[PDB]
Amino acid sequence: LLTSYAVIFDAGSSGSRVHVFNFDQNLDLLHIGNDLEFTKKIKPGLSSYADKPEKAAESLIPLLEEAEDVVPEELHPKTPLKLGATAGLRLLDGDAAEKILQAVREMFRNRSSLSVQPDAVSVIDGTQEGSYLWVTVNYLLGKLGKKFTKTVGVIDLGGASVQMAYAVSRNTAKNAPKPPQGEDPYMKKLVLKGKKYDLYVHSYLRYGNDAARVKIFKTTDGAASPCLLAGYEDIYRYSGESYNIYGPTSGANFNECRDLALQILRLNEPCSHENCTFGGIWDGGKGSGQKNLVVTSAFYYRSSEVGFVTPPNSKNRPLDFETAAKQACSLTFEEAKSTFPNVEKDKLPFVCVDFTYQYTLLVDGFGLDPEQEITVAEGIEYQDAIVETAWPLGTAIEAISSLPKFNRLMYF
Numbered sequence: 001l002l003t004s005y006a007v008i009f010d011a012g013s014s015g016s017r018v019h020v021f022n023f024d025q026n027l028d029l030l031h032i033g034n035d036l037e038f039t040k041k042i043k044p045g046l047s048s049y050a051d052k053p054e055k056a057a058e059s060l061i062p063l064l065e066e067a068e069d070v071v072p073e074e075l076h077p078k079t080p081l082k083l084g085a086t087a088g089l090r091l092l093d094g095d096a097a098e099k100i101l102q103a104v105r106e107m108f109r110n111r112s113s114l115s116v117q118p119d120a121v122s123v124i125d126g127t128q129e130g131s132y133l134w135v136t137v138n139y140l141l142g143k144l145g146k147k148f149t150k151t152v153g154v155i156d157l158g159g160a161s162v163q164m165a166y167a168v169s170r171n172t173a174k175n176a177p178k179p180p181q182g183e184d185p186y187m188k189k190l191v192l193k194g195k196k197y198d199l200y201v202h203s204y205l206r207y208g209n210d211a212a213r214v215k216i217f218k219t220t221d222g223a224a225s226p227c228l229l230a231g232y233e234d235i236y237r238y239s240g241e242s243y244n245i246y247g248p249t250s251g252a253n254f255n256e257c258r259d260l261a262l263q264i265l266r267l268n269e270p271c272s273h274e275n276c277t278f279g280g281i282w283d284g285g286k287g288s289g290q291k292n293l294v295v296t297s298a299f300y301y302r303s304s305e306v307g308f309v310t311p312p313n314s315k316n317r318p319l320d321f322e323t324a325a326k327q328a329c330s331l332t333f334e335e336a337k338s339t340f341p342n343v344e345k346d347k348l349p350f351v352c353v354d355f356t357y358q359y360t361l362l363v364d365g366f367g368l369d370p371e372q373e374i375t376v377a378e379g380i381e382y383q384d385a386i387v388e389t390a391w392p393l394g395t396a397i398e399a400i401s402s403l404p405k406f407n408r409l410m411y412f
């Protein structure tokens with residue numbers, strides 16, 4: 001049987017992450033050491049070098065060298081290498097994101113020993129990003145090739161954007177409205193293990209967790225934020241901008257903080273085609289494709305640090321996020337430090353604002369039922385190993401499914 005490794009970089013908003021996978025001729029994963037995935041990451045991301053694109057590309061070299069050392073030397077020249085940048089670069093002002101990508105593909109050309117195609121490096125669309133992760137989760141859960149009603153939908157809360165993506169009926173596809181704005185179309189048509197799927201996919205730029213914070217902080221810009229704790233003041237920098245932020249002397253307030261999160265969503269935008277989520281964006285119908293959700297990335301990190309989410313994934317309910325928020329916003333900054341010792345020091349001030357936003361996004365934003373069961377994940381146990389629940393596996397499956405004489409497990 002023909003074999004192939006794939007190296008896939010996810011250039012996210014707050015970090016860059018290389019994934020290395022290995023596949024047989026059927027697009028079934030193969031081991032690398034004890035594992036089914038090798039991945040490492042670095043912070044900060046590409047967007048943090050908006051002024052110095054050459055240095056953005058150099059930041060990735062450690063990762064590239066690590067991944068090359070993993071793929072056997074004789075196999076380098078025929079091993080695809082891809083990089084997909086997401087909402088971080090999507091928020092840059094334009095000349096700058098292309099200048100970064102140019103440096104990256106020069107570096108790949110000048111320094112990689114792997115296979116670099118003319119499409120290797122790009123800022124991928126939100127819809128592809130949603131879709132790739134959908135593939136990732138449903139592959140890993142073996143729900144792939146089944147009727148759309150037996151597949152799992154996904155919500156990816158990255159730092160700068162959030163994607164919703166779930167499978168949908170020929171019917172809801174046929175009648176999907178034209179997108180508004182400014183906005184990518186709602187449907188993506190793909191074939192996965194011999195069956196055609198019609199994915200609803202939307203990406204909401206600036207509604208990622210970190211970007212959402214900023215929207216919240218701006219609604220009190222002269223003043224104290226109800227989402228922040230007593231004792232706490234600093235300048236918060238995000239996407240080229242500084243904000244002077246601080247908690248009230250009387251302390252955080254869950255309800256007031258909740259109001260700001262709802263306000264940021266613009267839930268009362270005109271909705272040109274019902275039913276909407278927020279900002280006049282069509283929900284895609286909310287059929288059986290979406291009854292079961294796997295929820296990832298920032299829904300995982302802080303939750304697992306305070307401990308109510310469990311590795312590599314766990315069953316939860318949206319209200320789990322409301323109860324964590326109430327708990328976090330009941331505390332001073334000093335108290336938050338001692339009570340939540342596993343939260344990263346530079347994330348700790350935002351526990352109140354993060355959880356109340358996570359909650360109100362799931363429930364008010366996406367209309368989820370506070371008591372409905374969801375799964376929260378960094379990974380899914382696949383055979384004897386854990387493979388990460390992020391978009392790049394989907395992209396690796398696309399790339400290798402197109403090698404000559406390989407199974408076209410996915411495309412389009």
Ligand SMILES: [Mn+2]
Pocket residue numbers: 012013086158159297
């Ligand atoms: Mn991401």
